[PDB]
Design a protein around this ligand. Structure first.
Ligand SMILES: CO[C@@H]1O[C@H](CO)[C@@H](O)[C@H](O)[C@@H]1O
Ligand SMILES: CO[C@@H]1O[C@H](CO)[C@@H](O)[C@H](O)[C@@H]1O
Ligand SMILES: CO[C@@H]1O[C@H](CO)[C@@H](O)[C@H](O)[C@@H]1O
Ligand SMILES: CO[C@@H]1O[C@H](CO)[C@@H](O)[C@H](O)[C@@H]1O
Ligand SMILES: [Ca+2]
Ligand SMILES: [Ca+2]
Ligand SMILES: [Ca+2]
Ligand SMILES: [Ca+2]
Ligand SMILES: [Mn+2]
Ligand SMILES: [Mn+2]
Ligand SMILES: [Mn+2]
Ligand SMILES: [Mn+2]
Lengths: 237, 237, 237, 237
């Protein structure tokens, strides 16, 4: 299977697979069963912002999700990603719907990675920022139901022409270049990511969420990973 | 044929095909015959730095090459790259040797592209920085004789096991991700590139040069573009 | 007097001092009499974005102002700022009102300066970005009627508590740190700036405009520089 | 008294005042007695690199010091800097010598601060990078014996005309602009700092160390804070 690290914005409490019984943000290390969660007031129809930060020194993977009204949820988990992730990875966004649904609309997405060697000034870095997604976004690998160009937005899951979300959808966007996320010789490996999203559901309850993830370079949507699996895992192990 | 925009650090006067009779910096718009050149005193065995700068507002492509003792060569050329390059590109480094040779050693390579649209705050950006090239450097596409990892460097052309450069070599390094170099709705598209290089010819009779280039995404080294053609062009037209 | 370089967003045609007879963008080199202007459709009440770019290689100072509807005005002027500006400078925004008025509201402001030496990797850089201005913005020197903290915005000129603009107002905001804008030894000196603004007038015609400027470090509003003088010059010489 | 948060590269064990009995890296929260230290093998006459990293989400301040041969020391400490520093600060470098001495030579110094608020896209940022310090370097506040310009470096403490360091020296370099280190409404405040240093003791008996610090804006060198007090603290409490 793929190797996944993710920060999940999980809109739907799947308590059968260990979700807490509320919308929550979570840190997923090789399992959908968040090593750590925090309660999250997902505000239906509002533009939210997620920030993900890690460095190899502190070895603490941190995430915050906030809305303009100031409500914010945070989660941090101590993890040495050198021991989790392959040295080269891709990074992406993933979202799903199930039986319940929501738009999983990405308005913007940036990422910075840094690999600082002992050698003096010898930082390697990758940064990208998408504030506008075009129809044919060639630096983005779109997977599953992921489309771009739709209000300048990335729709990770299916939406109808009227902006109505479809259920049992999964989709992801990976940045095209492999990312060197750690290196033997590196003093500091550090990455941060930000994305802004608009999760809107006409249902009883929104589902299933958005995740920022780091995978093996050849990572693909696991079959069946709609719903609670968030486009990330083949199962709930 | 590929579409190439390049800045050439041309170490070998091929007067035969329109080079000036001295080592020079040149701007190459779809031809190895520079639209503009400037005399360049290549310092054998020294680390030089080339900067390349363009924005879509000023519509001037500028390049400078310097060495630590302060000596520098500059060339700039008015061109609207929107009329030249496709909307998506790859950017890269190329080098060649021919009858004569030199180390085409790249010690560092950074690049920033920005696309600032109309919509308000909607910059797309890419930036990468390589101060250290690794043996297997998955965000570079290595072409021809280009290799990475030998002293943390990118050797664009063949160097024998003892640091001794080889004739009739060509190699290139393209950043893996396509680059949105322009867009109709962008207010500003800008890019700048820096690389540091070590050109050493054991005889001080160097050939043929290094180039920063921008090409069609599927650019490959044209057949028999060693020597004066710098791995960029199929001929000297 | 101060030494001023500015990009003006000039909302009011003062043809007595050489303004073209329309709103225009302009490049001001030590005079309010733009060395170069372009017609500008200032859209009353809309959020506009100005981008200013220069580098020391191309020696072309470029500016674009755009609105979300895609209307954009550009101006570029060849100028070697090494010959204009002191080596250390401050950078800022300025705006004025006269007999006519407008809000001169700055929503955001960023600036990057870069000073790259021959010495290898030896960039100096300053970057700042204000997307939110607070009441007591200590990295900003506010001059004249300039206030911050008002919707998270910088109001360069007087506005009443109901957001109504006042005439015969001038104000500016300078970034606190001196900026090293050029250096003998530098291979590349380059700066860019962006700001977003909301110019709204209830009058017949808006006045007088917003400028991004670079001055001597001790620069202050010239007395009387409300109105067409834009907070920049003591007169129209 | 000033409020100091610092990372110390402490070259001289003052066991007397709680140093461990070896050269060490330390995190100093309002006291020269580090909350956390780590053993540091200072390499006489080599260029070392220190990285300091904090974000307000993870609430862990981490520092690493390395030398080109790969050897490195790391310390991290959970602290919420919002409860420690004022909202606005200056950031700087400090060094001292005492009975014993060393070059406290800074070759480069960069810093990034970000304040990411609630409002959507509303990052405030500051970044500066000094790879070259100039004789009159108007964006640094030089305090005590600190000087700039000698080999393009910042000598934090006195060095005789022949490169020979002096005892009982103190000096500091603060970036000129106040830094918005935190804000109540910010979702994320983060900062990171890097500097490269050359500590040379002709005898290999070095004292006293270099620190990266964050202080009240009006921080000055406390009286008799040469030696073990690193120009940071008025006493060793
Ligand atoms: C209750 O059934 C589920 O619906 C929720 C919301 O979609 C998902 O968590 C899950 O995987 C199924 O598809
Ligand atoms: C003399 O033949 C050439 O050698 C020079 C010097 O390398 C090149 O410019 C060229 O294309 C051929 O390979
Ligand atoms: C017509 O009088 C003027 O009003 C316009 C608009 O304010 C300004 O250009 C000028 O300086 C005076 O104050
Ligand atoms: C022995 O006296 C001290 O010298 C050492 C070594 O420099 C310092 O730590 C200290 O504060 C005094 O100056
Ligand atoms: Ca779930
Ligand atoms: Ca040639
Ligand atoms: Ca005017
Ligand atoms: Ca000590
Ligand atoms: Mn979950
Ligand atoms: Mn040529
Ligand atoms: Mn004018
Ligand atoms: Mn100590």
């Amino acid at each position: 299977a793929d190797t996944i690290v993710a920060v999940e914005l999980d809109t739907y409490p799947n308590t059968d697979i260990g979700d807490p019984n509320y919308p929550h943000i979570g840190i997923d290390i090789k399992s959908v069963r968040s090593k750590k969660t925090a309660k999250w007031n997902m505000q239906n129809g509002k533009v939210g912002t997620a920030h993900i930060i890690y460095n190899s020194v502190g070895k603490r993977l941190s995430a915050v999700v906030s809305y303009p009204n100031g409500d914010s949820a945070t989660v941090s988990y101590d993890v040495d990603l050198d021991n989790v992730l392959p040295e080269w990875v891709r990074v992406g966004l993933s979202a799903s719907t199930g039986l319940y649904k929501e738009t999983n609309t990405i308005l913007s997405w940036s990422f910075t990675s840094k690999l600082k060697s002992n050698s003096t000034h010898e930082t390697n870095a990758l940064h990208f920022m998408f504030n506008q997604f075009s129809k044919d976004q060639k630096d983005l690998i779109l997977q599953g139901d992921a489309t771009t160009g739709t209000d300048g937005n990335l729709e990770l899951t299916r939406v109808s022409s009227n902006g109505s979300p479809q259920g049992s959808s999964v989709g992801r966007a990976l940045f095209y270049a492999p990312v060197h996320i750690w290196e033997s010789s590196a003093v500091v490996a550090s990455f941060d990511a930000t994305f802004t999203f608009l999760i809107k559901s006409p249902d009883s309850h929104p589902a299933d969420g958005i995740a920022f993830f780091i995978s093996n370079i050849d990572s693909s949507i696991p079959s069946g990973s709609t719903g609670r699996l968030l486009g990330l895992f083949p199962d709930a192990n």
